[PDB]
Design an enzyme around this catalytic site. Structure first.
Site, PDB file in Angstrom:
ATOM      1  N   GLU B  34       0.688  -0.931   0.335  1.00 62.54           N
ATOM      2  CA  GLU B  34       0.039  -0.111   0.128  1.00 62.54           C
ATOM      3  C   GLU B  34       0.779   1.179  -0.041  1.00 62.54           C
ATOM      4  O   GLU B  34       1.896   1.391   0.713  1.00 62.54           O
ATOM      5  CB  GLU B  34      -0.646  -0.227   1.051  1.00 62.54           C
ATOM      6  CG  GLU B  34      -2.309   0.273   0.588  1.00 62.54           C
ATOM      7  CD  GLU B  34      -3.134   0.867   2.272  1.00 62.54           C
ATOM      8  OE1 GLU B  34      -4.001   1.045   1.648  1.00 62.54           O
ATOM      9  OE2 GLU B  34      -2.726   0.457   2.921  1.00 62.54           O
ATOM     10  N   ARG B 109      -4.417  -4.435  -0.111  1.00 60.21           N
ATOM     11  CA  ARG B 109      -5.271  -3.840  -0.104  1.00 60.21           C
ATOM     12  C   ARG B 109      -5.730  -3.884  -0.974  1.00 60.21           C
ATOM     13  O   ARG B 109      -5.070  -4.702  -2.013  1.00 60.21           O
ATOM     14  CB  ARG B 109      -5.911  -3.098   0.725  1.00 60.21           C
ATOM     15  CG  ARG B 109      -5.731  -2.589   2.183  1.00 60.21           C
ATOM     16  CD  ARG B 109      -7.068  -1.894   2.435  1.00 60.21           C
ATOM     17  NE  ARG B 109      -6.900  -1.582   3.674  1.00 60.21           N
ATOM     18  CZ  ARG B 109      -6.237  -0.850   4.652  1.00 60.21           C
ATOM     19  NH1 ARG B 109      -5.221  -0.195   4.609  1.00 60.21           N
ATOM     20  NH2 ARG B 109      -6.623  -1.227   6.431  1.00 60.21           N
TER      21      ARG B 109
HETATM   22  N1  LIG Z   1      -9.284   3.913   0.690  1.00 57.45           N
HETATM   23  C1  LIG Z   1      -8.865   4.553   2.474  1.00 57.45           C
HETATM   24  N2  LIG Z   1      -9.230   5.540   2.496  1.00 57.45           N
HETATM   25  C2  LIG Z   1      -9.602   5.874   4.062  1.00 57.45           C
HETATM   26  N3  LIG Z   1      -7.897   5.425   4.594  1.00 57.45           N
HETATM   27  C3  LIG Z   1      -7.433   4.598   4.223  1.00 57.45           C
HETATM   28  C4  LIG Z   1      -7.867   3.875   3.107  1.00 57.45           C
HETATM   29  N4  LIG Z   1      -6.805   2.889   2.668  1.00 57.45           N
HETATM   30  C5  LIG Z   1      -5.357   3.556   3.716  1.00 57.45           C
HETATM   31  N5  LIG Z   1      -5.870   4.416   4.672  1.00 57.45           N
HETATM   32  C6  LIG Z   1      -5.631   4.760   5.974  1.00 57.45           C
HETATM   33  C7  LIG Z   1      -5.762   3.654   7.417  1.00 57.45           C
HETATM   34  C8  LIG Z   1      -4.866   3.835   7.927  1.00 57.45           C
HETATM   35  O1  LIG Z   1      -4.411   5.184   8.689  1.00 57.45           O
HETATM   36  C9  LIG Z   1      -3.532   3.718   6.497  1.00 57.45           C
HETATM   37  C10 LIG Z   1      -3.361   2.586   6.081  1.00 57.45           C
HETATM   38  O2  LIG Z   1      -2.839   2.327   4.772  1.00 57.45           O
HETATM   39  O3  LIG Z   1      -4.408   4.762   5.492  1.00 57.45           O
END
Ligand SMILES: Nc1ncnc2c1ncn2[C@H]1C[C@H](O)[C@@H](CO)O1
Ligand SMILES: Nc1ncnc2c1ncn2[C@@H]1O[C@H](COP(=O)(O)OP(=O)(O)O)[C@@H](O)[C@H]1O
Ligand SMILES: Nc1ncnc2c1ncn2[C@@H]1O[C@H](COP(=O)(O)OP(=O)(O)O)[C@@H](O)[C@H]1O
Ligand SMILES: Nc1ncnc2c1ncn2[C@H]1C[C@H](O)[C@@H](CO)O1
Lengths: 221, 241
Positions: B34, B109
């Protein structure tokens, strides 16, 4: 398919002109700006009311709906002999005129801008070669001509636009297209031909002759 | 012929840990991180000349910004989070596992998480209005009718932890931006993943998902307690494919 981008300031008359051009030849088709898609998802009114809040959301939608509709019209349409597709504005206009302007006025912050450029870069690196212009037609009208014409068209969302907004956008278009001093990181655009046309006069006058110049411009391409 | 396995789970479920360890079992396995680091230090590309004299400036943290004011910054976040994700997934799809015999590319993810779990929630929580929510779904769908097909998953591994475990592991990790996330946020996301991946009741705009195989693993335990069993399960999972 030869791709022509029709550029000019707000209410210079690009939809008017391009609609007129479409009829000259059956080999000629047009991609309008999706202003109805924008009025009713009314992101256009939103940004003009609150430019610091809705500017980035607008540029994204704007550019996205433009890429969509430009691509739809190559992926279908036209066995046509020598086909031309005219674009109402371009992805370059969105970024280097409007989005850049909003940044320069502080309606986008550094973060928003950077994200907007990174999305523009990527979005355009997937296609780019696919939507590259073969020519530009810069419809040139003064800020005041353009303020008058906004009032003539009568669209509710644009009635508040101050002249100073239009002068700004006018300076960006002159710099990009007339003085050629504005630098885009698309270096082929520096060798793209540009037909400049004065469209300040009423179309009852001078206008039809302009269309004869266009038939010409597209002989050399 | 690369099998794509998406790795799903709440925040601090331990996805980064498990799959970066799990990938050592095979050279035919690679992982797409990610791109969180891009979100907390935002940068665009530099001019070919500018970069020889100019440093790549440390950008804003659009991850902090979103946490600090979600009704302002959720749309902008989701849009960039998804763009950067796709971009990295596609780049590694075209990039790695040339001389690989049975290649598996594990995603951290998916584009479906970002829409159906994260963005779906900010809408529901009123951090995104209808316009933002409609603009976003329009973009997502389009992006999916292009680069999708190329991105379709062959499976999902769902690392299941309790909201409470997540919260704990958030403190453990020590990521500054996330330190004020309340248990209730984690609860909502837990709920969304349950509906998607355990109960499979959540309604999607991509039909194949209803059929995609899903392996559910309980990672509430200390890493070494369940590691043996989790790796067994996973391998018996990749062979069903
Ligand atoms: N698609 C998303 N929408 C809102 N927040 C997101 C998303 N993907 C990751 N996160 C946040 C959660 C964790 O803090 C951290 C882990 O990737 O980033
Ligand atoms: N040369 C012209 N003379 C008089 N009216 C014009 C002329 N060109 C455009 N108009 C009118 O001015 C308004 C703005 O033109 P339009 O083509 O909608 O501009 P744009 O699409 O570039 O915003 C429209 O009412 C149009 O009928
Ligand atoms: N099984 C486990 N037992 C104890 N700590 C774990 C375990 N799995 C992960 N951690 C720790 O929890 C934190 C979050 O892990 P991370 O792998 O970043 O989760 P995610 O990738 O899902 O956000 C990190 O500190 C990691 O070291
Ligand atoms: N890329 C853009 N950024 C900001 N505004 C834009 C953009 N494109 C069109 N417009 C506006 C101009 C007129 O108000 C109306 C007609 O095109 O829409």
């Amino acid at each position: 398919i030869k791709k022509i981008s029709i550029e000019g300031n707000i209410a210079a008359g690009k939809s008017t002109f391009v609609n007129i051009l479409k009829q000259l030849s059956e080999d000629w088709e047009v991609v309008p700006e999706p202003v109805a898609r924008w009025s009713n998802v009314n992101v256009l009114q939103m940004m003009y009311e609150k430019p610091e809040r809705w500017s980035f959301t607008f540029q994204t939608y704007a550019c996205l709906s433009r890429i969509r509709a430009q691509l739809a019209s190559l992926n279908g349409k036209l066995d046509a002999e020598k086909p031309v597709l005219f674009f109402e504005r371009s992805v370059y206009s969105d970024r280097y005129i409007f989005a850049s302007n909003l940044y320069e006025s502080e309606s986008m912050n550094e973060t928003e801008w950077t994200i907007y450029q990174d999305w523009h870069d990527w979005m355009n690196n997937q296609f780019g070669q696919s939507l590259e212009l073969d020519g530009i037609i810069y419809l040139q009208a003064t800020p005041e001509t353009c303020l008058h014409r906004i009032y003539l068209r009568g669209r509710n969302e644009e009635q508040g636009i101050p002249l100073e907004y239009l002068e700004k956008l006018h300076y960006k278009h002159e710099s990009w297209l007339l003085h050629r001093t504005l630098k885009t990181n698309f270096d082929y655009l520096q060798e793209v031909p540009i037909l400049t046309l004065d469209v300040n006069e009423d179309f009852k006058d001078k206008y039809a002759s302009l269309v004869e110049k266009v038939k010409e411009f597209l002989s050399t391409l």
